[PDB]
């Protein structure tokens, strides 16, 4: 038992948090009432679910989640949701108005009005935990709250509990469903202000998720519901190594131990496979070799990048369902022999396989088909720098003519910090291409 409370900030962060908590309850057999049925004690008495959930005096299980947002409506839906009795009112913190997709508003103007209350609640939750490894943060880059307040919380946690592994999840913007025009601005702002303080970030590519759930899921116009559904699915796929007894990524420090050998290289690639639509749920289940080849294919990758153009740094394989290890080695050898997998010389780190035998569940009535064997591959490659190349030119196209900066300047932060953030991102891409070249 090693507790890990989670902080959910921003509109998109709260939505994906709702989704992943619903799916956690589904897999763990926890009804919305929160009680623990005798027949639903999934885990064989293991407290690996007690890592995320806290049992009250009446046997009710309460998750260690801190739903934070500056707008009341998104958390009003949580209050009116079917899991209303699952979360205590103290766990959810509401603001009087959102940051309006403005980083300075979510960081400097209105963030400080509730940062103290959020920290008090977090400390209250942490004092009851004796094996607190760290914090998992869910937030959206485009959101003014989801970037500004996320950075403020990250800095506060680092200055307070800097020895804890602060894993993070982020939502990459996408032009089709872009919330605002100023998404590159606050994206780079939070990336600069959180690069040192964060531990390991799992960016979620809204373009990529939209593409995969448009193509494979047989939906022509996916709304937010399906997007956050799939994001919750992949988040739970990642965290299954923590929620159950396993062989790889058992603790939160292991993530940074395996995927972040050095700072600023903490943006590993995530991939989930197979994904099949509910309308075609009766298709043949893909074998281990097929699903491995699928997750190595860019079609099922969930961040828009080309790993073949890049250089792998470190790869780890997570397995859910009945998966034969010998078949795993066969698939790995096949992929290595056919697909040109390149590794840096100075880091001889290989491929790590951790198999969890619990099959993955799906939301009731959702578009995702039940699958008996699924594979989630986490790898770090310099190809992810293509995302930063998407962001930096999008930023420069407006910064050269200095657009939309009057809001940020008037909200109490100096203009020079924009140039500082751009210089930091230039240094980051320099390190990326240096690792890519020096190998």
């Amino acid at each position: 038992m090693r507790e890990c409370i989670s902080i959910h900030v921003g509109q998109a962060g709260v939505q994906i948090g709702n989704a992943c908590w619903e799916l956690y309850c589904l897999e763990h057999g926890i009804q919305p009432d929160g009680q623990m049925p005798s027949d639903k004690t999934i885990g064989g008495g293991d407290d690996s679910f007690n890592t995320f959930f806290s049992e009250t005096g009446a046997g009710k299980h309460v998750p260690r989640a801190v739903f934070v947002d500056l707008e009341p409506t998104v958390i009003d839906e949580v209050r009116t949701g079917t899991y209303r009795q699952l979360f205590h009112p103290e766990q959810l913190i509401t603001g009087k108005e959102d940051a309006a997709n403005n980083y300075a508003r979510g960081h400097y103007t209105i963030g400080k009005e509730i940062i103290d209350l959020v920290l008090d609640r977090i400390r209250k939750l942490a004092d009851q935990c004796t094996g607190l490894q760290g914090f998992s943060v869910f937030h959206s880059f485009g959101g003014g709250t989801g970037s500004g307040f996320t950075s403020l919380l990250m800095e506060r946690l680092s200055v307070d509990y800097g020895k804890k592994s602060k894993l993070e999840f982020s939502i990459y913007p996408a032009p089709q469903v872009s919330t605002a025009v100023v998404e590159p601005y606050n994206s780079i702002l939070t990336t600069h202000t959180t690069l040192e303080h964060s531990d390991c970030a799992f960016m979620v590519d809204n373009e990529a998720i939209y593409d995969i759930c448009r193509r494979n899921l047989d939906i022509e116009r996916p709304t937010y519901t399906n997007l956050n559904r799939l994001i919750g699915q992949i988040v739970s796929s990642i965290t299954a190594s923590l929620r159950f007894d396993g062989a790889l990524n058992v603790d939160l420090t292991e993530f940074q131990t395996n995927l972040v050998p050095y700072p600023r290289g903490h943006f590993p690639l995530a991939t989930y496979a197979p994904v099949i639509s509910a309308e075609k749920a009766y298709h043949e289940q893909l074998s281990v070799a097929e699903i491995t080849n699928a997750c190595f294919e860019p079609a099922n990758q969930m961040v828009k990048c080309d790993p073949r153009h890049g250089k792998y740094m470190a790869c780890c394989l997570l397995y859910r369902g009945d998966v034969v290890p010998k078949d795993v080695n066969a698939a790995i050898a096949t992929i290595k022999t056919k697909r040109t997998i390149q590794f840096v010389d100075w880091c001889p780190t290989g491929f790590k396989v951790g198999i969890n035998y619990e099959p993955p569940t799906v939301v009731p009535g959702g578009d995702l088909a039940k699958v008996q064997r699924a594979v989630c591959m986490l790898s770090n490659t310099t190809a992810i720098a293509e995302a930063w190349a998407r962001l930096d030119h999008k930023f420069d196209l407006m910064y050269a003519k200095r657009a939309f900066v009057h809001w940020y300047v008037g909200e109490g932060m100096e203009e020079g910090e924009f140039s500082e953030a751009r210089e930091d991102m230039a240094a980051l891409e320099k390190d990326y291409e240096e690792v890519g070249v020096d190998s």
Binding site: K96, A100, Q176, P184, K394, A400
Partner: protein
Amino acid sequence: MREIVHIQAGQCGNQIGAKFWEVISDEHGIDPTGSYHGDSDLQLERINVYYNEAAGNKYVPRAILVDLEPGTMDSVRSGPFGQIFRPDNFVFGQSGAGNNWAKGHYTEGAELVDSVLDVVRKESESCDCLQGFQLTHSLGGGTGSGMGTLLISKIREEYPDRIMNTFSVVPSPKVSDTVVEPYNATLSVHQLVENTDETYCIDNEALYDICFRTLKLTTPTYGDLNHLVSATMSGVTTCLRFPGQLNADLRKLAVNMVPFPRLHFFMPGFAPLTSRGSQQYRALTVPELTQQMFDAKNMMAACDPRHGRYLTVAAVFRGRMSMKEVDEQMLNVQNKNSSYFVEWIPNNVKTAVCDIPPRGLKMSATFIGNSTAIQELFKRISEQFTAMFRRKAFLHWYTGEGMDEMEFTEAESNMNDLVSEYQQYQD
């Protein structure tokens, strides 16, 4: 929860606001007495943004009838939806500015704006969280212009953090009288360069144009103009008064549209606009709506969008459409008309979808766009106002009211600066 205080000034402004309140009340299923006789709660989701309920389902609009002439509220309150407004919001002067900016802003403006601000504070203290103010006024009248300018100035002084958008009804030389109106219009726009965070330009040239040749009416009357501009703001505020994926409130809108502190003027757009002697009994398809909306024949600003480049634009669609073809037609428009969009602000095109269409049309689509083509109205204002300056046309009517020519000089300087800035951003 993000309630907006709506303020209407001037005779035309008050008429416009009353008609707009009536149409949106009809859209929300509100009777003249304030009770809700609709069918769905989707209109009730964000109904509190503009309305308040007091123990009887009587949704009183958060509207303020302000005008230095008491007869304007007497005429408005006699309408079908004129009595639904809160009686305390009726503030009227006893002297009248007489279509004068100096009297309507300096002396007679203050003696009424003190009470108006008292009313505004009374509404805001009862409002949990207020995001902005809505202003409708006619720049031709010297009363409403001065009142509104004073409102914006002292509101920014009191609430620098509270955003504000306004519906500026730009008059016309061919619509209204032309004696001292250019001076008042110049002063008004000079105030709006810095006082307002957002501004919608409504131009009477294109207004009469659309009301006459597209609506096929021999002699346009102010009632039809009122109806068209009210439908325009219905479409524009569809984003605020209804929920949507974009979730655009006032500050979200300003951030996603205004790229620079001084470039806060938008040109509205409405579709379809059919004459009431040939109105189609069918519904326009997506390509037809697209080619009608982006044409110059659907903008309430008398500006040629082909002359300039679209800085940031958004399109709000109401009705039952398959949005796949909507996104398709928008991307074909972006590819085809790339010369009319500035390339240095990526993703400056926006699409919003709504399910409740306006009455009389099952399908509708409204457009708001920030373009550099609006510099030409500043140019024409300059052509009028400099020609009246070089001869000091009736300047002694403003000197004797405590207003000097230094303010007009600062106004012309700011106008020239805005024209130059728009031209330099064209490239």
